[PDB]
Design an enzyme around this catalytic site. Structure first.
Site, mmCIF file in Angstrom:
data_model
loop_
_atom_site.group_PDB
_atom_site.id
_atom_site.type_symbol
_atom_site.label_atom_id
_atom_site.label_comp_id
_atom_site.label_asym_id
_atom_site.label_seq_id
_atom_site.Cartn_x
_atom_site.Cartn_y
_atom_site.Cartn_z
ATOM 1 N N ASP A 1 25.231 8.565 9.255
ATOM 2 C CA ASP A 1 26.687 8.557 9.048
ATOM 3 C C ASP A 1 27.132 7.166 8.616
ATOM 4 O OD1 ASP A 1 26.404 7.318 11.648
ATOM 5 O OD2 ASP A 1 27.634 8.809 12.654
ATOM 6 N N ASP B 1 27.387 15.535 14.371
ATOM 7 C CA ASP B 1 28.521 15.455 15.275
ATOM 8 C C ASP B 1 29.714 14.867 14.517
ATOM 9 O OD1 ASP B 1 28.318 12.447 15.532
ATOM 10 O OD2 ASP B 1 26.357 13.047 16.322
ATOM 11 N N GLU C 1 31.213 12.134 15.725
ATOM 12 C CA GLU C 1 31.190 10.752 16.172
ATOM 13 C C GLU C 1 30.554 9.896 15.075
ATOM 14 O OE1 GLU C 1 31.410 10.520 20.453
ATOM 15 O OE2 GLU C 1 32.818 11.856 19.428
ATOM 16 N N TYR D 1 42.628 -2.005 1.062
ATOM 17 C CA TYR D 1 42.085 -2.079 2.413
ATOM 18 C C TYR D 1 43.043 -2.755 3.382
ATOM 19 C CZ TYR D 1 38.072 -1.553 5.510
ATOM 20 O OH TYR D 1 37.211 -1.103 6.494
ATOM 21 N N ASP E 1 27.609 7.675 23.734
ATOM 22 C CA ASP E 1 28.734 6.935 23.170
ATOM 23 C C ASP E 1 28.630 6.747 21.657
ATOM 24 O OD1 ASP E 1 26.495 5.372 23.367
ATOM 25 O OD2 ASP E 1 27.518 3.588 24.122
ATOM 26 N N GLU F 1 26.144 13.691 7.308
ATOM 27 C CA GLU F 1 25.340 13.955 8.498
ATOM 28 C C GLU F 1 25.159 15.445 8.749
ATOM 29 O OE1 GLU F 1 26.056 11.219 11.855
ATOM 30 O OE2 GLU F 1 26.016 12.934 13.204
ATOM 31 N N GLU G 1 39.379 4.125 5.410
ATOM 32 C CA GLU G 1 38.415 4.216 6.507
ATOM 33 C C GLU G 1 38.087 5.648 6.917
ATOM 34 O OE1 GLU G 1 36.204 2.628 8.686
ATOM 35 O OE2 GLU G 1 36.353 1.300 6.938
ATOM 36 N N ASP H 1 0.813 -1.222 0.000
ATOM 37 C CA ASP H 1 0.000 0.000 0.000
ATOM 38 C C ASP H 1 0.839 1.262 0.000
ATOM 39 O OD1 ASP H 1 0.954 -0.147 2.633
ATOM 40 O OD2 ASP H 1 -0.991 -0.101 3.586
ATOM 41 N N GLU I 1 26.538 6.874 16.372
ATOM 42 C CA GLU I 1 25.876 7.147 17.639
ATOM 43 C C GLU I 1 24.377 6.898 17.599
ATOM 44 O OE1 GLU I 1 27.403 9.532 15.797
ATOM 45 O OE2 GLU I 1 25.636 10.588 15.046
ATOM 46 N N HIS J 1 40.718 0.284 11.070
ATOM 47 C CA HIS J 1 39.725 0.998 11.856
ATOM 48 C C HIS J 1 40.345 1.671 13.076
ATOM 49 C CE1 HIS J 1 36.876 -1.560 9.643
ATOM 50 N NE2 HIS J 1 36.198 -0.428 9.688
ATOM 51 N N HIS K 1 32.653 4.147 0.782
ATOM 52 C CA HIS K 1 33.586 3.083 0.425
ATOM 53 C C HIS K 1 33.501 2.778 -1.072
ATOM 54 C CE1 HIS K 1 35.546 1.694 4.057
ATOM 55 N NE2 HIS K 1 34.416 1.449 4.695
ATOM 56 N N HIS L 1 28.961 6.453 5.262
ATOM 57 C CA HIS L 1 30.244 5.758 5.378
ATOM 58 C C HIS L 1 30.276 4.637 4.349
ATOM 59 C CE1 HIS L 1 33.668 3.861 7.904
ATOM 60 N NE2 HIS L 1 33.294 2.815 7.187
ATOM 61 N N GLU L 2 29.177 3.876 4.321
ATOM 62 C CA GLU L 2 29.302 2.683 3.477
ATOM 63 C C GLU L 2 29.292 3.082 2.014
ATOM 64 O OE1 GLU L 2 30.342 0.257 4.952
ATOM 65 O OE2 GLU L 2 29.565 0.455 6.993
ATOM 66 N N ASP M 1 42.629 -6.533 12.237
ATOM 67 C CA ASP M 1 41.848 -5.475 11.594
ATOM 68 C C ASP M 1 42.506 -4.997 10.312
ATOM 69 O OD1 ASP M 1 39.820 -3.619 11.303
ATOM 70 O OD2 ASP M 1 40.858 -2.061 12.454
ATOM 71 N N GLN N 1 2.723 2.357 2.286
ATOM 72 C CA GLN N 1 2.938 2.917 3.618
ATOM 73 C C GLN N 1 3.885 2.012 4.400
ATOM 74 O OE1 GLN N 1 -0.918 3.831 5.412
ATOM 75 N NE2 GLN N 1 -1.491 4.760 3.443
#
Ligand SMILES: CC(C)[C@H](Cc1cn(Cc2ccc(C(=O)O)cc2)nn1)C(=O)N[C@@H](CCCCN)C(=O)O
Ligand SMILES: O=C[C@H](O)[C@@H](O)[C@H](O)[C@H](O)CO
Ligand SMILES: [Ca+2]
Ligand SMILES: [Ca+2]
Ligand SMILES: [Ca+2]
Ligand SMILES: [Ca+2]
Ligand SMILES: [Zn+2]
Length: 316
Positions: A138, A185, A187, A157, A200, A177, A166, A59, A190, A231, A146, A142-143, A226, A61
């Site tokens: 964000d 921000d 960050e 990478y 955080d 953002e 990164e 529909d 978040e 990262h 990439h 971010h993705e 990593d 929605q």
């Protein structure tokens, strides 16, 4: 799918209502025909085969709780499309209006998101560590960034080029953002991290040390985890980018900030015109300096602020 362009309405992950561009052909699909060759959002249905089924709704929605991650994945891909077009004159991630595809409900309780070489993928989070990750603009930017990097500099990478890869994604994730201008921000993540803990995030660009990430070359990780800490060491570049925009004194080195837009112009240019798959940190500095030079002149504050910032994070 072939059909007619329409506009659906629904709520995202955080309970906010927004309109979304859809396509009608028996069902209403999460297919946005107003941006390049289209933005397409899919349902992975809690499994890991990709991309899944093009999201279909009877529909138009999208207020079910199951709908929310798709709503946001779809909307924020559009916002990110808009950022790159309006702000850098770039059409989609390949610069040639490539179709943008996303899948949500990837696996079960999956605390993460990623670009798999061809599309964005978003877990729903386990509900305690994370909520559906597409709720984070964000994260979404971010993705998709990439994909931009992979089509431009192609930063490998691993090690310093992977850390740059990164940081680039955190930097434009953050610039996007701000662009949407909703609780912006420096960050990362978040909006979808630890619903039960306020304040955080996964990473901080303004103070990487907050989450154990280095904020100076002398603090770089040299182990193999990593991918050589892509990262982790990204904090050294995130910190530089933060200083270039916002300014500050860091380990005694003062930087005059030049604001977000110039940060964005300088790093976009470095990314698309100077960086290469194996660029290391010091090469990034020279790319950003040359970028600032091109844009604002050798004698600019801009160039001088870029040097200050890299001096402050120990990158010469
Ligand atoms: C905000 C977001 C973009 C993100 C954050 C992220 C998610 N995870 C998993 C994770 C899981 C649990 C916790 C915990 O505190 O319990 C923390 C982190 N680790 N980092 C992130 O950075 N994801 C990677 C995923 C793709 C990496 C390709 N190897 C990326 O996009 O670079
Ligand atoms: O905090 C230091 C000011 O940004 C100048 O530099
Ligand atoms: Ca519906
Ligand atoms: Ca925010
Ligand atoms: Ca953020
Ligand atoms: Ca939290
Ligand atoms: Zn990343």
């Amino acid at each position: 799918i072939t059909g007619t362009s329409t506009v659906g309405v629904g709520r995202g992950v955080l309970g906010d209502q927004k309109n979304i561009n859809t396509t009608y052909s028996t069902y209403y699909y999460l297919q946005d025909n107003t941006r390049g060759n289209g933005i397409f959002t899919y349902d992975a249905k809690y499994r890991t085969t990709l991309p899944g089924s093009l999201w279909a709704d009877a529909d138009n929605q999208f207020f079910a709780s199951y709908d929310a991650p798709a709503v946001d994945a779809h909307y924020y891909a559009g916002v990110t499309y808009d950022y790159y077009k309006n702000v850098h004159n770039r059409l989609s991630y390949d610069g040639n209006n490539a179709a943008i595809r996303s899948s949500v409900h990837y696996s079960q309780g999956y605390n993460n998101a990623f670009w798999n070489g061809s599309q964005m993928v978003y877990g729903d989070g386990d509900g305690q560590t994370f909520i559906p990750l597409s709720g984070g603009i964000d994260v979404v930017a971010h993705e998709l960034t990439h994909a931009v990097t992979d089509y431009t500099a192609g930063l490998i990478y691993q090690n310093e080029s992977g850390a740059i890869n990164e940081a680039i994604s955190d930097i434009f994730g953050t610039l996007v953002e701000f662009y949407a201008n909703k609780n912006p921000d420096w960050e990362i993540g978040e909006d979808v991290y630890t619903p039960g803990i306020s304040g955080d995030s996964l990473r901080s660009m303004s103070d990487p040390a907050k989450y154990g990430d280095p904020d100076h070359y002398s603090k770089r990780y040299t182990g193999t985890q990593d991918n050589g800490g892509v990262h982790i060491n990204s904090g050294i570049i995130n910190k530089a980018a933060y200083l270039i925009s916002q300014g500050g004194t860091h380990y005694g080195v003062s930087v005059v900030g030049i604001g977000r837009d110039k940060l964005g112009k300088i790093f976009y240019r470095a990314l698309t015109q100077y960086l290469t798959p194996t660029s290391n940190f010091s090469q990034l500095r020279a790319a950003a300096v040359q970028s600032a030079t091109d844009l604002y002149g050798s004698t600019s504050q801009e160039v001088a602020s870029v040097k200050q910032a890299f001096d402050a994070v120990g990158v010469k």
